[PDB]
């Protein structure tokens, strides 16, 4: 098992992210535009699917 606080710390780096709908890039949680250039800085973002 993993201590609850440590699991929260690790989740920050690989669980709480936004995903662009055009190039599947990882984005910060509060982002509004993709940073990559090949998708044209699109603003069609969705949250990263949770584990359940």
């Amino acid at each position: 098992i993993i201590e609850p606080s440590l699991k929260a710390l690790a989740s920050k780096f690989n669980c709480d992210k936004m995903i662009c709908r055009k190039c599947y890039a990882r984005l910060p949680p509060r982002a509004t535009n993709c940073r990559k250039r090949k998708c044209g800085h699109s603003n069609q973002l969705r949250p990263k699917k949770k584990l359940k």
Binding site: I1, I2, L6, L9, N14, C15, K50, L51
Partner: protein, 191 residues
């Protein structure tokens, strides 16, 4: 639209000395000395008062003015580092396989080296060498901590990111396998 005058100021405490020549900054204080080169930016440095440094840009564009604030905070970081230092902390997160590390001493030069063994039960021994001026220690306050300290934020932070990026899980669901080493706290040596 070009802005005529944009100015910023940096205070300097009465403990250290600073000298600027040909856009080459040298900062020296109680805890050591650092140098940075800013020859790629057109800035005019000046001494506003007895303990205030001024810098400004004339007839700059919107893109050019943006770099003015970037320069100000970088030099302030240099002043803090030479009088207060930096300190990073890291933690180990594992489910089944314990993670063993060995911070061996100086290898006939100033660099420190960290050895990581038994990551998710693999037979690789993986080695990373820190930048000069950075010292790595095993914490005794409590279990599973790495403490990194030094004078310059750029060297301390980049070396810390090197350790985190080397422990990666491949061909697995990363929402389930949270194994790895992560950074958890940033601060100064003093206070």
């Amino acid at each position: 639209m070009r802005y005529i005058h944009s100015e910023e100021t940096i205070p300097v405490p009465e403990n250290l000395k600073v000298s600027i020549k040909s856009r080459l900054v040298t900062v020296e204080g109680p805890r050591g000395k650092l140098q940075k080169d800013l020859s790629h930016i057109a800035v005019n440095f000046s001494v506003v008062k007895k303990g205030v440094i001024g810098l400004e840009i004339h007839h700059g564009s919107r893109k050019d003015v943006a770099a003015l604030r970037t320069v100000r905070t970088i030099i302030n970081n240099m002043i803090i580092g030479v009088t207060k230092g930096f300190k990073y902390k890291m933690r180990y997160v594992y489910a089944h396989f314990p993670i063993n590390v060995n911070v061996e001493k100086n290898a006939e030069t100033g660099c420190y080296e960290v050895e990581i063994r038994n990551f998710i039960g693999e037979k690789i021994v993986r080695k990373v060498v820190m930048a000069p001026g950075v010292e790595v220690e095993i914490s005794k306050a409590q279990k599973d901590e790495l403490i990194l300290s030094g004078n310059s934020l750029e060297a301390v932070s980049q070396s810390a990111a090197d350790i985190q990026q080397i422990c990666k899980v491949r061909n697995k669901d990363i929402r389930k396998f949270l194994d790895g080493i992560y950074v958890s706290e940033k601060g100064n040596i003093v206070e």
